[PDB]
Symmetry: D2
Subunit: 115 residues, 4 copies
């Protein structure tokens, strides 16, 4: 599990459950191609998106559908989604955790990169 996504809700102080997540990888032709997708679990975590074999050097985009999330809680949020864009696996393979903390008009994202 070289790529993991974790989402917290800053209004409720709890994991953000059932948040859709789509990952894309920048193609040879500069296009965003579909790489992996998942929903967060009761702990707000999404494991198993990829494998170290699949997850090669590349520019990746992790899209967290925060608008759907807030709307289901009756909140009409500012952002369409949270987008995280980064180069992965230059120094060789690493483990990436992409965290986001969500509020209706604000979010933050941090990466924790290992080995």
């Amino acid at each position: 599990c070289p790529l993991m996504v974790k989402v917290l809700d800053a209004v409720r102080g709890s994991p953000a459950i059932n948040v859709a997540v789509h990952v894309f990888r920048k193609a040879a032709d500069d296009t965003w191609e579909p790489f992996a997708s998942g929903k967060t679990s009761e702990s707000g975590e999404l494991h198993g998106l990829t494998t170290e074999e699949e997850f090669v050097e590349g520019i990746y985009k992790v899209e967290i559908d925060t608008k759907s999330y807030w709307k289901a809680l009756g909140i009409s949020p500012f952002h369409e989604h949270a987008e995280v864009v980064f180069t992965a696996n230059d120094s060789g393979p690493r483990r990436y955790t992409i965290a986001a903390l969500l509020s209706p008009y604000s979010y933050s994202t941090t990466a924790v990169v290992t080995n």
Copy 2:
């Protein structure tokens, strides 16, 4: 100024100066078209991006070139850029201020919508 961008640097505790900012508007074929751009001023702000006449309802993307900012300071950054995607919507006469606070492996962004 219906739309303003403000960037701060969390490592140095200062406005983030000379950061390039590109704004796009989503067009009918779901493609991003270039709408407005500039670089932040000594105060970390970018004013004069658009006019009320131009700024119509629609989905906009604001892209903050964080990677180049960190590179020109010698600091190894994680993200390619910071992205903010939102729907501008009447109701109204709102000023949108898109603010962002930058660290090498983390950013936050918030929208302040007034008047």
Copy 3:
């Protein structure tokens, strides 16, 4: 104004208005003594807290009454208040801006030190 405070609301995407702010200076017996206070303005800002003559080097604490702010909006908050503790130090002629971005279970704060 050598010291300014600025608060934003991440749930509503607006300045945080009428938030009480207390500033203290640490005295010789390691006790906090009341230095300056006020409430944020319609723009979420609090100016005029001190003067350059008064603001000498020392350890200061800035306490933002977040709990009362959330309660007057009906939202159940986690923190009693947000606290910022720092050493003011010459080098210099700096303006200190203490900014804070508020959610019910989360806050961030940043210092912007200029001139």
Copy 4:
């Protein structure tokens, strides 16, 4: 383990290791009395501070010594420490995770509260 503390470094994108943490509990006489203390582990987490028997209703202060942390990395940071102040265990016992994300001039803190 009803109280856990987790600290991330936003400059390095890694857990913040060996960060001292002190917890206080507000006494009957309005004084902050010493409750528990610990250092974060290689994962940036601090477990075992207290027990559900010990950890009664109260107002608590979690002090994270961020200045020592940054100074050991050669950074002279803005803040003396991060202070998190909250009422614990009104609805009966809960599980509290206090997270902080650190930068030299900025930090954020979020609580995740369970059961």
